[PDB]
Design a binder for this molecule. Structure first.
Ligand SMILES: O=C(CCCC[C@@H]1SC[C@@H]2NC(=O)N[C@@H]21)Nc1ccc([N+](=O)[O-])cc1
Ligand SMILES: O=C(CCCC[C@@H]1SC[C@@H]2NC(=O)N[C@@H]21)Nc1ccc([N+](=O)[O-])cc1
Ligand SMILES: O=C(CCCC[C@@H]1SC[C@@H]2NC(=O)N[C@@H]21)Nc1ccc([N+](=O)[O-])cc1
Ligand SMILES: O=C(CCCC[C@@H]1SC[C@@H]2NC(=O)N[C@@H]21)Nc1ccc([N+](=O)[O-])cc1
Lengths: 120, 120, 120, 120
């Protein structure tokens, strides 16, 4: 089985820590991004998400509320377990910027990927 | 101030209810999609997310754990208020499918938009 | 049959003209965006793409080389015809910004939608 | 400088060959995908795109018209040259499926990434 609980790093060097996954698949945690628009402002930020529970290789999503920005990121992906028991989270994300009004909405959403592996 | 608590519909005819937003910006709710890969299977599905609290037009994210599929969707966006006090959630989403192993990961993520308005 | 040759406008107020589609489905055209990072700089910009030829409601893609920015946008979508013969291009786009080096790549891609209808 | 002309492979094993880039930045080529929904049907497929010309690390876009599917992919990205002169294309893509009518449009667009390096 693949549970999101534990510490992970991604290909950009970011670290996240996920706490216990409850029987609904809900989890909370923290996210320390390695990069930001203004990296001098980065602080540890909370995340909240849901994974599927029954599946051995569950899909999941989570939201990161950046504590140093008005932006928000969502990640979604799947936890894969390989033939040696190694786990990888394959994810894609949307990063929503805050803009002043709806005329700027078109430019407010970035997209990308991240691959996560366990810290230990 | 643009509020997320309440009942919403989107341009595809889906509806969602969002409960009280706590001091950390966290909220739960229930999502009824109007469309699915297998629409005969649609059931009500829980959502869990975070919005920014201070901002008048906050960004936010949430995860929908589909209760009838192995897939997961994440939505992110911003709540805008126009001159007459009418709210719109401008959102983008990623829909993650479950695939068998990492070699199929490339085809597992769909993207789209949704605009939500308040029900009555 | 849903045709791409002609003049189109989208939900942001941008317009484009598309020239004759050749036997391989290839087409050129000119794009006038209604919005930009620096809207004072907007100039007409060339587009180049390919549609499917046989299909009545073809999928297609095109690239817009912005003539006033180092960025590039790609659009992909499908041309639909309703019961009355009215056409709509349902599209999604990626907008690539120029960044200084690969360590900034994560923030360089924006995503969004556009719906196009025929001008008159 | 970074010109797209030449042969490239990506992280999925796909190969593309780009021909001469003209003075407008337009280029054509072919794309042999390693993966598809129906890999038994894969055939070499044409691409058409535009890069920026003046920039040492240009952004670009291209469209692949799959010759074995009704789908279309667009790629956009940037060519980076590192301190040793090695080139990498960092890209993201949208893959548009053909659906029967507009009621299915919501599920028709996949998103992903690819990193390309030169074959030789
Ligand atoms: O910088 C931010 C907040 C931090 C985002 C980190 C992103 S989350 C996707 C990716 N994966 C990671 O591990 N880290 C990155 N937001 C922001 C950036 C730029 C602008 N802007 O206006 O340019 C506005 C908000
Ligand atoms: O059908 C599903 C689950 C329901 C997804 C509804 C989407 S969420 C984005 C959009 N906005 C809405 O309000 N509703 C739609 N998932 C799914 C679909 C197709 C496949 N597939 O393999 O084709 C696998 C899983
Ligand atoms: O402004 C630009 C170039 C023009 C892009 C217009 C976009 S194409 C998707 C959408 N549909 C339209 O019809 N028009 C918009 N690029 C740009 C924007 C912002 C930044 N930035 O750094 O913030 C860099 C480059
Ligand atoms: O399979 C296809 C056509 C080939 C797409 C190859 C993609 S392009 C992005 C990525 N990078 C690569 O180098 N290769 C992959 N299209 C398709 C797939 C599935 C469905 N479907 O309905 O499930 C419809 C069309």
């Amino acid at each position: 089985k693949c549970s999101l609980t534990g510490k992970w790093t991604n290909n950009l060097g970011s670290i996240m820590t996920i706490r216990a996954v409850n029987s609904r698949g809900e989890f909370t945690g923290t996210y320390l991004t390695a990069v930001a628009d203004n990296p001098g402002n980065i602080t540890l930020s909370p995340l909240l998400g849901i994974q599927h529970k029954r599946a051995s290789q569950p899909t999941f999503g989570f939201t990161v509320h950046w504590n140093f920005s008005e932006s928000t990121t969502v990640f979604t992906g799947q936890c894969f377990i390989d033939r040696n028991g190694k786990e990888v989270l394959k994810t894609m994300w949307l990063l929503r910027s805050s803009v002043n009004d709806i005329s700027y909405d078109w430019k407010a959403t970035r997209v990308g990927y991240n691959n996560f592996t366990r810290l230990s």
